[PDB]
């Protein structure tokens, strides 16, 4: 498509969909990118050289969260646009439907990186509209293929709530969800609902099960409806199975103590 292959840092990623990447570029069979400034080039050489320049070895904004190897940078669409602009171009290679590219300023971009000697490496990000048409904690979410199926999605998902969590403003993802995203949430809400069942041998509410969580009442209910736990209902034998499951190998989980972020 526009195009077939790209080279990120080291890895070569096979795109899923087209991206506006300027005709002149798109046409080129492979699109070399630069791990950090996210600049599209035309050749390995043009890339290979440019890398002596740059000096960018991590995302533009401030680190809001750093624990162990993982980190998130809250990049403002306004402050450092072109990056965000390029993030969208990169992202669209993996989102079938993605409006907004050039108009980045209205969004905040939260980019997750996995860090080592060579730098703070982009592993994926999520989008969030500054001032919301609909109260919408997630506008977009993406994890690069080479990192997928490793719990980075949930991490980002989870992070996105902690954000709205301490906003007091419980939101939800931009609901025309991709197929992949859909499962990511459906399965995240489950885990996080079945979470509290084992962490409160007392029973209470749905609107309380909210707030203390942030998964808005519309959701989580639809989740429970998708379960054998619809009823505004505890399945002690499942709530067990999952908290039993977690004890095998935990996540790559967000630690709220390790996040420096004030709302508004
Ligand atoms: C609001 C919006 O804009 S929606 C946009 C949706 N995004 C996209 O489609 C962009 C491309 N997709 C991606 O970047 C990724 O695949 C994402 C964001 C969907 C998920 O990120 P990942 O790190 O790969 O997801 P993560 O590893 O955290 O876990 C979800 C996966 O675990 C699987 N899973 C199954 N059961 C469970 C469980 N109990 N707990 C956790 N995960 C489970 C899911 O099936 C899913 O796998 P799949 O990707 O093969 O369907
Ligand atoms: Zn660069």
mmCIF file of N, CA and C in Angstrom, residues 107-226:
data_model
loop_
_atom_site.group_PDB
_atom_site.id
_atom_site.type_symbol
_atom_site.label_atom_id
_atom_site.label_comp_id
_atom_site.label_asym_id
_atom_site.label_seq_id
_atom_site.Cartn_x
_atom_site.Cartn_y
_atom_site.Cartn_z
ATOM 1 N N UNK A 107 -4.712 18.052 20.368
ATOM 2 C CA UNK A 107 -4.541 16.801 21.116
ATOM 3 C C UNK A 107 -3.271 16.798 21.964
ATOM 4 N N UNK A 108 -3.314 16.065 23.077
ATOM 5 C CA UNK A 108 -2.110 15.682 23.821
ATOM 6 C C UNK A 108 -1.714 14.251 23.437
ATOM 7 N N UNK A 109 -0.425 14.042 23.190
ATOM 8 C CA UNK A 109 0.076 12.735 22.778
ATOM 9 C C UNK A 109 0.918 12.105 23.884
ATOM 10 N N UNK A 110 0.449 10.988 24.424
ATOM 11 C CA UNK A 110 1.171 10.273 25.471
ATOM 12 C C UNK A 110 1.952 9.100 24.883
ATOM 13 N N UNK A 111 3.272 9.234 24.754
ATOM 14 C CA UNK A 111 4.068 8.180 24.115
ATOM 15 C C UNK A 111 4.815 7.296 25.114
ATOM 16 N N UNK A 112 4.621 5.995 24.989
ATOM 17 C CA UNK A 112 5.260 5.024 25.855
ATOM 18 C C UNK A 112 6.588 4.586 25.242
ATOM 19 N N UNK A 113 7.650 4.569 26.039
ATOM 20 C CA UNK A 113 8.954 4.132 25.541
ATOM 21 C C UNK A 113 9.590 3.072 26.418
ATOM 22 N N UNK A 114 10.346 2.180 25.785
ATOM 23 C CA UNK A 114 11.165 1.207 26.500
ATOM 24 C C UNK A 114 12.623 1.636 26.366
ATOM 25 N N UNK A 115 13.253 1.856 27.512
ATOM 26 C CA UNK A 115 14.547 2.518 27.575
ATOM 27 C C UNK A 115 15.740 1.576 27.790
ATOM 28 N N UNK A 116 16.873 1.950 27.193
ATOM 29 C CA UNK A 116 18.160 1.275 27.394
ATOM 30 C C UNK A 116 19.275 2.259 27.074
ATOM 31 N N UNK A 117 20.520 1.777 27.053
ATOM 32 C CA UNK A 117 21.675 2.612 26.693
ATOM 33 C C UNK A 117 21.405 3.471 25.453
ATOM 34 N N UNK A 118 20.962 2.825 24.371
ATOM 35 C CA UNK A 118 20.771 3.495 23.073
ATOM 36 C C UNK A 118 19.684 4.577 23.110
ATOM 37 N N UNK A 119 18.844 4.564 24.141
ATOM 38 C CA UNK A 119 17.826 5.602 24.294
ATOM 39 C C UNK A 119 16.455 5.185 24.807
ATOM 40 N N UNK A 120 15.528 6.143 24.770
ATOM 41 C CA UNK A 120 14.146 5.923 25.171
ATOM 42 C C UNK A 120 13.327 5.682 23.899
ATOM 43 N N UNK A 121 13.100 4.402 23.599
ATOM 44 C CA UNK A 121 12.572 3.938 22.311
ATOM 45 C C UNK A 121 11.066 3.879 22.248
ATOM 46 N N UNK A 122 10.489 4.503 21.219
ATOM 47 C CA UNK A 122 9.042 4.508 21.038
ATOM 48 C C UNK A 122 8.496 3.081 20.940
ATOM 49 N N UNK A 123 7.588 2.722 21.845
ATOM 50 C CA UNK A 123 6.923 1.424 21.757
ATOM 51 C C UNK A 123 5.444 1.570 21.406
ATOM 52 N N UNK A 124 4.928 2.792 21.518
ATOM 53 C CA UNK A 124 3.535 3.100 21.166
ATOM 54 C C UNK A 124 3.036 4.313 21.929
ATOM 55 N N UNK A 125 1.834 4.763 21.610
ATOM 56 C CA UNK A 125 1.296 5.960 22.231
ATOM 57 C C UNK A 125 -0.216 5.848 22.322
ATOM 58 N N UNK A 126 -0.845 6.858 22.920
ATOM 59 C CA UNK A 126 -2.282 7.080 22.752
ATOM 60 C C UNK A 126 -2.629 8.577 22.667
ATOM 61 N N UNK A 127 -3.762 8.878 22.030
ATOM 62 C CA UNK A 127 -4.243 10.250 21.804
ATOM 63 C C UNK A 127 -5.389 10.674 22.720
ATOM 64 N N UNK A 128 -5.504 11.987 22.935
ATOM 65 C CA UNK A 128 -6.500 12.572 23.842
ATOM 66 C C UNK A 128 -6.768 14.034 23.482
ATOM 67 N N UNK A 129 -8.015 14.338 23.116
ATOM 68 C CA UNK A 129 -8.411 15.694 22.705
ATOM 69 C C UNK A 129 -8.353 16.644 23.889
ATOM 70 N N UNK A 130 -7.666 17.773 23.724
ATOM 71 C CA UNK A 130 -7.505 18.745 24.809
ATOM 72 C C UNK A 130 -8.839 19.052 25.465
ATOM 73 N N UNK A 131 -9.694 19.758 24.735
ATOM 74 C CA UNK A 131 -11.027 20.081 25.216
ATOM 75 C C UNK A 131 -12.008 19.220 24.435
ATOM 76 N N UNK A 132 -12.825 18.468 25.165
ATOM 77 C CA UNK A 132 -13.592 17.376 24.574
ATOM 78 C C UNK A 132 -14.988 17.752 24.078
ATOM 79 N N UNK A 133 -15.287 17.312 22.856
ATOM 80 C CA UNK A 133 -16.634 17.354 22.283
ATOM 81 C C UNK A 133 -17.521 16.410 23.094
ATOM 82 N N UNK A 134 -17.058 15.169 23.229
ATOM 83 C CA UNK A 134 -17.595 14.204 24.176
ATOM 84 C C UNK A 134 -16.489 13.939 25.197
ATOM 85 N N UNK A 135 -16.844 13.839 26.481
ATOM 86 C CA UNK A 135 -15.867 13.484 27.516
ATOM 87 C C UNK A 135 -15.254 12.134 27.138
ATOM 88 N N UNK A 136 -14.004 12.176 26.666
ATOM 89 C CA UNK A 136 -13.411 11.085 25.880
ATOM 90 C C UNK A 136 -11.963 10.748 26.222
ATOM 91 N N UNK A 137 -11.737 10.047 27.330
ATOM 92 C CA UNK A 137 -10.369 9.853 27.820
ATOM 93 C C UNK A 137 -9.352 9.320 26.802
ATOM 94 N N UNK A 138 -9.813 8.589 25.789
ATOM 95 C CA UNK A 138 -8.918 8.139 24.712
ATOM 96 C C UNK A 138 -9.467 8.458 23.314
ATOM 97 N N UNK A 139 -8.677 9.183 22.527
ATOM 98 C CA UNK A 139 -9.050 9.497 21.155
ATOM 99 C C UNK A 139 -8.474 8.475 20.205
ATOM 100 N N UNK A 140 -7.311 7.936 20.576
ATOM 101 C CA UNK A 140 -6.631 6.904 19.792
ATOM 102 C C UNK A 140 -5.614 6.122 20.615
ATOM 103 N N UNK A 141 -5.302 4.897 20.189
ATOM 104 C CA UNK A 141 -4.303 4.075 20.883
ATOM 105 C C UNK A 141 -3.600 3.085 19.954
ATOM 106 N N UNK A 142 -2.279 3.031 20.050
ATOM 107 C CA UNK A 142 -1.504 2.215 19.146
ATOM 108 C C UNK A 142 -0.248 1.711 19.836
ATOM 109 N N UNK A 143 0.077 0.449 19.575
ATOM 110 C CA UNK A 143 1.346 -0.153 19.991
ATOM 111 C C UNK A 143 1.968 -0.774 18.748
ATOM 112 N N UNK A 144 3.208 -0.409 18.455
ATOM 113 C CA UNK A 144 3.855 -0.924 17.266
ATOM 114 C C UNK A 144 3.893 -2.451 17.272
ATOM 115 N N UNK A 145 3.712 -3.069 16.088
ATOM 116 C CA UNK A 145 3.679 -4.514 15.924
ATOM 117 C C UNK A 145 4.775 -5.250 16.692
ATOM 118 N N UNK A 146 6.032 -4.845 16.530
ATOM 119 C CA UNK A 146 7.134 -5.573 17.172
ATOM 120 C C UNK A 146 7.011 -5.628 18.703
ATOM 121 N N UNK A 147 6.115 -4.831 19.279
ATOM 122 C CA UNK A 147 5.942 -4.847 20.725
ATOM 123 C C UNK A 147 4.604 -5.435 21.166
ATOM 124 N N UNK A 148 3.719 -5.712 20.207
ATOM 125 C CA UNK A 148 2.338 -6.117 20.503
ATOM 126 C C UNK A 148 2.245 -7.448 21.199
ATOM 127 N N UNK A 149 1.084 -7.696 21.801
ATOM 128 C CA UNK A 149 0.795 -8.935 22.535
ATOM 129 C C UNK A 149 1.720 -9.153 23.735
ATOM 130 N N UNK A 150 2.220 -8.057 24.306
ATOM 131 C CA UNK A 150 3.129 -8.112 25.463
ATOM 132 C C UNK A 150 2.626 -7.284 26.656
ATOM 133 N N UNK A 151 1.343 -6.918 26.635
ATOM 134 C CA UNK A 151 0.728 -6.182 27.738
ATOM 135 C C UNK A 151 0.954 -4.683 27.756
ATOM 136 N N UNK A 152 1.570 -4.153 26.703
ATOM 137 C CA UNK A 152 1.778 -2.708 26.585
ATOM 138 C C UNK A 152 0.466 -1.991 26.321
ATOM 139 N N UNK A 153 -0.431 -2.662 25.605
ATOM 140 C CA UNK A 153 -1.759 -2.134 25.310
ATOM 141 C C UNK A 153 -2.532 -1.852 26.577
ATOM 142 N N UNK A 154 -2.713 -2.882 27.398
ATOM 143 C CA UNK A 154 -3.382 -2.690 28.679
ATOM 144 C C UNK A 154 -2.682 -1.593 29.486
ATOM 145 N N UNK A 155 -1.340 -1.651 29.566
ATOM 146 C CA UNK A 155 -0.584 -0.625 30.285
ATOM 147 C C UNK A 155 -1.099 0.741 29.858
ATOM 148 N N UNK A 156 -1.044 1.004 28.558
ATOM 149 C CA UNK A 156 -1.443 2.293 28.051
ATOM 150 C C UNK A 156 -2.902 2.573 28.393
ATOM 151 N N UNK A 157 -3.759 1.590 28.102
ATOM 152 C CA UNK A 157 -5.171 1.652 28.456
ATOM 153 C C UNK A 157 -5.292 2.081 29.908
ATOM 154 N N UNK A 158 -4.797 1.234 30.810
ATOM 155 C CA UNK A 158 -4.814 1.530 32.232
ATOM 156 C C UNK A 158 -4.333 2.954 32.529
ATOM 157 N N UNK A 159 -3.145 3.307 32.038
ATOM 158 C CA UNK A 159 -2.605 4.647 32.218
ATOM 159 C C UNK A 159 -3.674 5.672 31.891
ATOM 160 N N UNK A 160 -4.335 5.491 30.749
ATOM 161 C CA UNK A 160 -5.333 6.458 30.282
ATOM 162 C C UNK A 160 -6.468 6.723 31.286
ATOM 163 N N UNK A 161 -6.801 5.713 32.089
ATOM 164 C CA UNK A 161 -7.790 5.889 33.146
ATOM 165 C C UNK A 161 -7.225 6.606 34.345
ATOM 166 N N UNK A 162 -6.071 6.161 34.841
ATOM 167 C CA UNK A 162 -5.402 6.863 35.932
ATOM 168 C C UNK A 162 -5.404 8.371 35.666
ATOM 169 N N UNK A 163 -5.157 8.749 34.411
ATOM 170 C CA UNK A 163 -5.271 10.142 33.996
ATOM 171 C C UNK A 163 -6.643 10.709 34.318
ATOM 172 N N UNK A 164 -7.677 10.183 33.665
ATOM 173 C CA UNK A 164 -9.045 10.634 33.918
ATOM 174 C C UNK A 164 -9.492 10.331 35.351
ATOM 175 N N UNK A 165 -8.940 9.266 35.932
ATOM 176 C CA UNK A 165 -9.213 8.885 37.315
ATOM 177 C C UNK A 165 -9.007 10.086 38.222
ATOM 178 N N UNK A 166 -7.767 10.565 38.289
ATOM 179 C CA UNK A 166 -7.448 11.693 39.155
ATOM 180 C C UNK A 166 -7.904 13.040 38.581
ATOM 181 N N UNK A 167 -8.561 13.001 37.425
ATOM 182 C CA UNK A 167 -9.290 14.158 36.923
ATOM 183 C C UNK A 167 -10.635 14.244 37.643
ATOM 184 N N UNK A 168 -11.096 13.102 38.161
ATOM 185 C CA UNK A 168 -12.447 12.952 38.714
ATOM 186 C C UNK A 168 -13.463 12.761 37.603
ATOM 187 N N UNK A 169 -12.990 12.943 36.375
ATOM 188 C CA UNK A 169 -13.811 12.966 35.181
ATOM 189 C C UNK A 169 -13.672 11.630 34.465
ATOM 190 N N UNK A 170 -14.562 10.697 34.789
ATOM 191 C CA UNK A 170 -14.528 9.363 34.201
ATOM 192 C C UNK A 170 -14.954 9.394 32.734
ATOM 193 N N UNK A 171 -14.047 8.985 31.845
ATOM 194 C CA UNK A 171 -14.315 9.008 30.410
ATOM 195 C C UNK A 171 -14.337 7.629 29.791
ATOM 196 N N UNK A 172 -14.360 7.602 28.464
ATOM 197 C CA UNK A 172 -14.277 6.361 27.710
ATOM 198 C C UNK A 172 -13.638 6.591 26.345
ATOM 199 N N UNK A 173 -13.152 5.512 25.710
ATOM 200 C CA UNK A 173 -12.445 5.587 24.434
ATOM 201 C C UNK A 173 -13.366 6.051 23.324
ATOM 202 N N UNK A 174 -12.800 6.707 22.315
ATOM 203 C CA UNK A 174 -13.557 7.131 21.146
ATOM 204 C C UNK A 174 -14.187 5.885 20.519
ATOM 205 N N UNK A 175 -15.501 5.740 20.699
ATOM 206 C CA UNK A 175 -16.203 4.447 20.528
ATOM 207 C C UNK A 175 -16.317 3.774 19.150
ATOM 208 N N UNK A 176 -16.049 4.503 18.048
ATOM 209 C CA UNK A 176 -15.804 3.682 16.849
ATOM 210 C C UNK A 176 -14.462 2.935 16.993
ATOM 211 N N UNK A 177 -14.477 1.852 17.771
ATOM 212 C CA UNK A 177 -13.282 1.067 18.063
ATOM 213 C C UNK A 177 -12.891 0.165 16.902
ATOM 214 N N UNK A 178 -11.587 -0.020 16.723
ATOM 215 C CA UNK A 178 -11.064 -1.024 15.812
ATOM 216 C C UNK A 178 -11.362 -2.384 16.401
ATOM 217 N N UNK A 179 -11.335 -3.411 15.563
ATOM 218 C CA UNK A 179 -11.494 -4.774 16.057
ATOM 219 C C UNK A 179 -10.499 -5.122 17.163
ATOM 220 N N UNK A 180 -9.221 -4.797 16.945
ATOM 221 C CA UNK A 180 -8.163 -5.095 17.908
ATOM 222 C C UNK A 180 -8.362 -4.337 19.198
ATOM 223 N N UNK A 181 -8.687 -3.056 19.068
ATOM 224 C CA UNK A 181 -8.956 -2.208 20.227
ATOM 225 C C UNK A 181 -10.123 -2.736 21.043
ATOM 226 N N UNK A 182 -11.175 -3.147 20.336
ATOM 227 C CA UNK A 182 -12.385 -3.651 20.957
ATOM 228 C C UNK A 182 -12.070 -4.749 21.962
ATOM 229 N N UNK A 183 -11.286 -5.745 21.547
ATOM 230 C CA UNK A 183 -10.915 -6.853 22.430
ATOM 231 C C UNK A 183 -10.052 -6.357 23.566
ATOM 232 N N UNK A 184 -9.157 -5.417 23.257
ATOM 233 C CA UNK A 184 -8.259 -4.823 24.247
ATOM 234 C C UNK A 184 -9.018 -4.236 25.428
ATOM 235 N N UNK A 185 -10.145 -3.575 25.146
ATOM 236 C CA UNK A 185 -10.997 -2.985 26.180
ATOM 237 C C UNK A 185 -11.904 -3.996 26.847
ATOM 238 N N UNK A 186 -12.704 -4.673 26.028
ATOM 239 C CA UNK A 186 -13.565 -5.734 26.503
ATOM 240 C C UNK A 186 -12.795 -6.577 27.526
ATOM 241 N N UNK A 187 -11.586 -7.002 27.167
ATOM 242 C CA UNK A 187 -10.766 -7.822 28.060
ATOM 243 C C UNK A 187 -10.113 -7.052 29.211
ATOM 244 N N UNK A 188 -9.909 -5.748 29.035
ATOM 245 C CA UNK A 188 -9.359 -4.922 30.120
ATOM 246 C C UNK A 188 -10.390 -4.683 31.214
ATOM 247 N N UNK A 189 -11.604 -4.332 30.804
ATOM 248 C CA UNK A 189 -12.669 -4.098 31.751
ATOM 249 C C UNK A 189 -12.930 -5.345 32.601
ATOM 250 N N UNK A 190 -13.005 -6.504 31.944
ATOM 251 C CA UNK A 190 -13.182 -7.782 32.632
ATOM 252 C C UNK A 190 -12.183 -7.871 33.771
ATOM 253 N N UNK A 191 -10.915 -8.043 33.413
ATOM 254 C CA UNK A 191 -9.824 -8.104 34.378
ATOM 255 C C UNK A 191 -9.981 -7.108 35.520
ATOM 256 N N UNK A 192 -10.354 -5.875 35.190
ATOM 257 C CA UNK A 192 -10.406 -4.808 36.186
ATOM 258 C C UNK A 192 -11.688 -4.854 37.029
ATOM 259 N N UNK A 193 -12.740 -5.466 36.488
ATOM 260 C CA UNK A 193 -13.962 -5.701 37.265
ATOM 261 C C UNK A 193 -13.749 -6.921 38.149
ATOM 262 N N UNK A 194 -13.440 -8.052 37.519
ATOM 263 C CA UNK A 194 -13.116 -9.273 38.243
ATOM 264 C C UNK A 194 -11.971 -9.038 39.224
ATOM 265 N N UNK A 195 -11.267 -7.924 39.052
ATOM 266 C CA UNK A 195 -10.215 -7.531 39.978
ATOM 267 C C UNK A 195 -10.797 -7.248 41.345
ATOM 268 N N UNK A 196 -11.723 -6.293 41.387
ATOM 269 C CA UNK A 196 -12.293 -5.817 42.641
ATOM 270 C C UNK A 196 -13.131 -6.852 43.389
ATOM 271 N N UNK A 197 -13.749 -7.775 42.654
ATOM 272 C CA UNK A 197 -14.506 -8.841 43.295
ATOM 273 C C UNK A 197 -13.644 -9.573 44.321
ATOM 274 N N UNK A 198 -12.423 -9.935 43.934
ATOM 275 C CA UNK A 198 -11.484 -10.563 44.864
ATOM 276 C C UNK A 198 -10.840 -9.573 45.847
ATOM 277 N N UNK A 199 -10.956 -8.271 45.572
ATOM 278 C CA UNK A 199 -10.364 -7.236 46.438
ATOM 279 C C UNK A 199 -11.394 -6.381 47.161
ATOM 280 N N UNK A 200 -12.278 -7.071 47.874
ATOM 281 C CA UNK A 200 -13.395 -6.473 48.583
ATOM 282 C C UNK A 200 -14.396 -7.599 48.758
ATOM 283 N N UNK A 201 -14.228 -8.353 49.841
ATOM 284 C CA UNK A 201 -15.164 -9.417 50.194
ATOM 285 C C UNK A 201 -16.462 -8.838 50.760
ATOM 286 N N UNK A 202 -16.591 -7.520 50.613
ATOM 287 C CA UNK A 202 -17.822 -6.780 50.842
ATOM 288 C C UNK A 202 -18.427 -6.462 49.471
ATOM 289 N N UNK A 203 -19.749 -6.324 49.410
ATOM 290 C CA UNK A 203 -20.423 -5.969 48.160
ATOM 291 C C UNK A 203 -21.081 -4.592 48.228
ATOM 292 N N UNK A 204 -21.020 -3.855 47.120
ATOM 293 C CA UNK A 204 -21.551 -2.495 47.083
ATOM 294 C C UNK A 204 -22.292 -2.140 45.788
ATOM 295 N N UNK A 205 -21.637 -1.392 44.896
ATOM 296 C CA UNK A 205 -22.362 -0.689 43.837
ATOM 297 C C UNK A 205 -21.782 -0.899 42.436
ATOM 298 N N UNK A 206 -22.417 -0.248 41.468
ATOM 299 C CA UNK A 206 -21.994 -0.211 40.085
ATOM 300 C C UNK A 206 -21.386 1.165 39.830
ATOM 301 N N UNK A 207 -22.057 2.195 40.348
ATOM 302 C CA UNK A 207 -21.592 3.579 40.275
ATOM 303 C C UNK A 207 -20.410 3.794 41.226
ATOM 304 N N UNK A 208 -20.310 2.947 42.249
ATOM 305 C CA UNK A 208 -19.139 2.928 43.128
ATOM 306 C C UNK A 208 -18.017 2.128 42.478
ATOM 307 N N UNK A 209 -18.372 0.976 41.903
ATOM 308 C CA UNK A 209 -17.438 0.165 41.116
ATOM 309 C C UNK A 209 -16.850 1.011 40.001
ATOM 310 N N UNK A 210 -17.599 2.024 39.567
ATOM 311 C CA UNK A 210 -17.047 3.113 38.769
ATOM 312 C C UNK A 210 -16.056 3.869 39.662
ATOM 313 N N UNK A 211 -16.100 5.201 39.648
ATOM 314 C CA UNK A 211 -15.216 6.074 40.448
ATOM 315 C C UNK A 211 -13.909 5.436 40.959
ATOM 316 N N UNK A 212 -14.047 4.447 41.842
ATOM 317 C CA UNK A 212 -12.935 3.643 42.348
ATOM 318 C C UNK A 212 -12.197 2.914 41.209
ATOM 319 N N UNK A 213 -12.642 3.143 39.974
ATOM 320 C CA UNK A 213 -12.091 2.459 38.815
ATOM 321 C C UNK A 213 -11.975 3.372 37.616
ATOM 322 N N UNK A 214 -13.102 3.990 37.260
ATOM 323 C CA UNK A 214 -13.214 4.949 36.149
ATOM 324 C C UNK A 214 -13.885 4.371 34.891
ATOM 325 N N UNK A 215 -13.908 3.042 34.763
ATOM 326 C CA UNK A 215 -14.647 2.388 33.677
ATOM 327 C C UNK A 215 -16.106 2.785 33.794
ATOM 328 N N UNK A 216 -16.535 3.750 32.978
ATOM 329 C CA UNK A 216 -17.875 4.348 33.109
ATOM 330 C C UNK A 216 -19.012 3.329 33.104
ATOM 331 N N UNK A 217 -20.060 3.639 33.869
ATOM 332 C CA UNK A 217 -21.218 2.766 34.050
ATOM 333 C C UNK A 217 -21.765 2.157 32.759
ATOM 334 N N UNK A 218 -21.947 2.965 31.693
ATOM 335 C CA UNK A 218 -22.315 2.329 30.427
ATOM 336 C C UNK A 218 -21.473 1.089 30.138
ATOM 337 N N UNK A 219 -20.152 1.245 30.089
ATOM 338 C CA UNK A 219 -19.244 0.103 29.967
ATOM 339 C C UNK A 219 -19.314 -0.702 31.259
ATOM 340 N N UNK A 220 -18.413 -1.667 31.436
ATOM 341 C CA UNK A 220 -18.365 -2.500 32.655
ATOM 342 C C UNK A 220 -19.686 -3.216 32.958
ATOM 343 N N UNK A 221 -20.795 -2.501 32.769
ATOM 344 C CA UNK A 221 -22.120 -3.097 32.781
ATOM 345 C C UNK A 221 -22.275 -3.939 31.517
ATOM 346 N N UNK A 222 -22.005 -3.324 30.361
ATOM 347 C CA UNK A 222 -22.008 -4.023 29.071
ATOM 348 C C UNK A 222 -20.996 -5.154 29.124
ATOM 349 N N UNK A 223 -19.921 -4.915 29.871
ATOM 350 C CA UNK A 223 -18.943 -5.946 30.149
ATOM 351 C C UNK A 223 -19.628 -7.062 30.923
ATOM 352 N N UNK A 224 -20.151 -6.753 32.111
ATOM 353 C CA UNK A 224 -20.859 -7.754 32.925
ATOM 354 C C UNK A 224 -21.988 -8.461 32.157
ATOM 355 N N UNK A 225 -22.646 -7.731 31.256
ATOM 356 C CA UNK A 225 -23.657 -8.305 30.361
ATOM 357 C C UNK A 225 -23.045 -9.304 29.386
ATOM 358 N N UNK A 226 -21.814 -9.019 28.971
ATOM 359 C CA UNK A 226 -21.028 -9.928 28.146
ATOM 360 C C UNK A 226 -20.542 -11.113 28.991
#
